[PDB]
Amino acid sequence: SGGRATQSPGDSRRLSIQRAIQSLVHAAQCRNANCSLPSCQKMKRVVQHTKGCKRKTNGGCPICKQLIALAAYHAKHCQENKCPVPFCLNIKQKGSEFPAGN
């Protein structure tokens, strides 16, 4: 939270995770059409790609694999059953597996 906390490389990675976590959610739920926020449009591309992907979870796609990662950290820190995050709902509904769309 703050004070005398230390961010090690590993934690800074997890921090960048939560950053691209928020990036994922933002893109997933961004209703603002004029929002040209850099991470938004980039995430929205990454997200909307998973939508039309088929190599996603069969151990093929990198993008959809990594997006699954972000959505999974987030999936535990999420409650919404109709969450905007694509891979969140696939993950936190399965809970056991990970593959999206089974």
Binding site: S23, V46, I63, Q66, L67, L70
Partner: peptide, 16 residues
Amino acid sequence: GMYPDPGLLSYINELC
């Protein structure tokens, strides 16, 4: 197992 390596935060690394 236990969180995949999230290359997405590398693919989309936010810099200003």
